[PDB]
Amino acid sequence: YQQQYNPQGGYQQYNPQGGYQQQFNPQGGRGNYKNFNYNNNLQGYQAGFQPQSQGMSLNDFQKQQ
Amino acid sequence: YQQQYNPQGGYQQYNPQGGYQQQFNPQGGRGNYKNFNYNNNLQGYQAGFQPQSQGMSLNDFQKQQ
Amino acid sequence: YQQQYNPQGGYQQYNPQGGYQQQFNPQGGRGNYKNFNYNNNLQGYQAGFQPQSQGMSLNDFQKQQ
Amino acid sequence: YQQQYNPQGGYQQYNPQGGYQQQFNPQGGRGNYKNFNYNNNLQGYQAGFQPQSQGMSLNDFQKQQ
Amino acid sequence: YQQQYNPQGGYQQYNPQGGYQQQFNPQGGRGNYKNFNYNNNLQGYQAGFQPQSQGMSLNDFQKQQ
Question: Where are the coiled-coil regions (chains A, B, C, D, E)?
Fold first, then answer.
């Protein structure tokens, strides 16, 4: 079993952009706001050696009883 | 079993863009807001060696009883 | 079993765009809003070696009882 | 068993666009809104070596009892 | 068993467009809205080596009992 990653040269720009500005933005409103959940996740790889790997794992969240 | 990844040269720009501005934006409203769940996830790979891998895994979320 | 990925040169721009601005945008409304779930997921690969891999897996979500 | 992917040169622009602006947009309305589920998923590959792979898998979601 | 993918040169623009603006847009209405499910999925491949692969798999969703 032989796994070989051998890059030569190259230009790599890794620029993921997440803009979350004013996620909660009511304008001129009247009322009540209860149980607001914001989950913002950014994950990634620039090149790299990662067999049998997992980027992001999320479970059991954002529940109201 | 032989796995070989050998890139030579090249220009790679990795620019995923997520815009979440004003996700919750009521304008001039009256009422009540309960149990708001926002799940924002960005994941990726620029090149890389990752056999038998998983990008993003999500389960058991956003439930109201 | 021989697997070989050997790219030479080339120009690759990876630019997926997700625009989620004002996802929830009532204008001049009256009422009640309960159990709003927004799932926004962006995932991908620019090049890369990933046999037997999975991009995104989601299960058991957005349920109201 | 021999699998060979060897691209030479070329110009590749990967630009999938998802516009989700004002997904929920009632204008001048009166009422009640309950159990709104929005699932927005964008996934893809620019080039890459991925035999026996799966892009996106989703099950068991958006149910009301 | 020999599988060979060797593209030379070429110009490839991958631009799938999904417009989901104002998916839910009642105008000047009165009533009640319950159990609204919107599933928006965009998936694809620009080039790439992927025998025995699956783009998108979805099951067991959008059910009301």
Answer: none
For the residues of C10-62, what is the DSSP string, one character each?
A: -EEEE--EEE-TTSB--BS-EEEEEEEEEEEEEEEEES-B-TT-EEEEEEEEE
What's this structure's resolution in Å?
Answer: 2.4
CA B16, CA D30: separation in Å to the nearest integer? 38
**What are the chain C neighbours of A64 within 8 Å (beta carbons)?**
35
What is the SS3 string spanning chain D?
CEEEECCECCEEEECCEEECCCCECCECCEEEEEEEEEEEEEEEEECCECCCCEEEEEEEEEEEC
Contact status, residue A18 vs residue B18, Cβ threshold 8 Å: yes
D55, two tokens = 């892009």
What residues contact residue D21 under an 8 Å CB cut-off, 6+ apart? Answer: C19, C20, C21, C22, C23, C25, E21, E22
* Minimal CA separation from A64 to chain C, in Å: 9
Per DSSP, A9 falls in state S
Nearest CA in chain E to C30: E30
d(CA E57, CA D41): 12
Residue of D nearest to C30 (CA): D30
Q: Three-class SS of residue A32? A: strand
Question: Rounded to an integer, what distance in angstroms lies between the CA atom of residue B14 and that of residue A44?
Answer: 10
Q: How many angstroms separate the CA atoms of B58 and C13, rounded?
A: 28
Consecutive H or E run containing B19: strand B17-19
> What is the distance, to the nearest Å, from the Cα of residue C64 to the centroid of all Cα atoms in its chain?
23
